[PDB]
Amino acid sequence: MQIRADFDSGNIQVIDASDPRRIRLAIRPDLASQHFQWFHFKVEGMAPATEHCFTLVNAGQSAYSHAWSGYQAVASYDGERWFRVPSQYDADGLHFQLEPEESEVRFAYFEPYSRERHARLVERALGIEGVERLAVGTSVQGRDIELLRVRRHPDSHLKLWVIAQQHPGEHMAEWFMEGLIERLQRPDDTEMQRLLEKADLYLVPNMNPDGAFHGNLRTNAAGQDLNRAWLEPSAERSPEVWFVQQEMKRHGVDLFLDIHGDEEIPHVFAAGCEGNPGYTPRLERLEQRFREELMARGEFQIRHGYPRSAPGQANLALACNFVGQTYDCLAFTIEMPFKDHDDNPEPGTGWSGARSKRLGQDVLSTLAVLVDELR
Ligand SMILES: [Zn+2]
CATH class of the missing domain: 2.60.40.3120 (Immunoglobulin-like)
Structure with missing residues (x-):
């Protein structure tokens, strides 16, 4: 042995x-x-x-x-x-x-x-109609940080951003992206047709390739927790976040989802920006809409999650809060369980890569429904 x-x-x-x-x-x-x-x-x-x-x-x-x-x-x-x-x-x-x-x-x-699958995922993405590698950043150890843009109409006006796995150990996150990207290969996808008429998608399949390759849980190669570097990004210590923020400034943001995985909670849920000094009635309404629509379509619930933040007490070093406030846009941290989504028990596999993919495609359906309310 x-x-x-x-x-x-x-x-x-x-x-x-x-x-x-x-x-x-x-x-x-x-x-x-x-x-x-x-x-x-x-x-x-x-x-x-x-x-x-x-x-x-x-x-x-x-x-x-x-x-x-x-x-x-x-x-x-x-x-x-x-x-x-x-x-x-x-x-x-x-x-x-x-x-x-x-x-x-x-x-x-x-x-x-694996980064091996990541590569095949990017390859397939670029073979999809209207999908392009808009830009590429570089990790501390020199690995690629692809920013893919899905654009099928030169007149769309909204920018929907989705980035994943800033935390290396949360592999369910990239699985979510695979499902989201693969849905783009459908011939007669009516919902996506409507969504793409009004918006472009900005996707970063993996925010921390060094951490993932080295089997890390929380930090990038430098030892920095990427989801604590949004207030003060470093070109040297947190290049992964620095890259994404430069591009966000270049194109703008009208929606932002940060995909993570939670070790403790056996339920899929979403944390919002209710603690942001910039948390407006408009954003509170949109967050209610989003959860309502997703709850009706995917494995997603609203009974459990993290304790809410008191008014104006959010930590802006977090991606969700930082982006949402900087751009005054709907923003959520999506959480998938390492255990199971107890609402729909499947003990033999628990939460899986497949269920992560399906959640990714259901989230697209939710966006299509809300596209006209974002701005
Ligand atoms: Zn995380």
């Missing part, structure tokens, strides 16, 4: 894998920050007809250790079909067991989205 993480988005430290019934492992802290929670490794040469019991020993010291409770690890034999496995959490850490049908299998905190 051999366990490794020497690959894209891999993360794990092997303690002792000599006894299948007592496998010890540790989660690796981010490149330049103390945060950790995301894990991704492969096991090879497992004995057949044998139970293998795994334990992430430092789960208790992870960034969000209270989120472990109720969480079921994800696994895959072919890296295509991912399934949930029996898991428990106590003082010794996160435990999960599996009697593998195959000699090899891989585990991860969520269905990984």
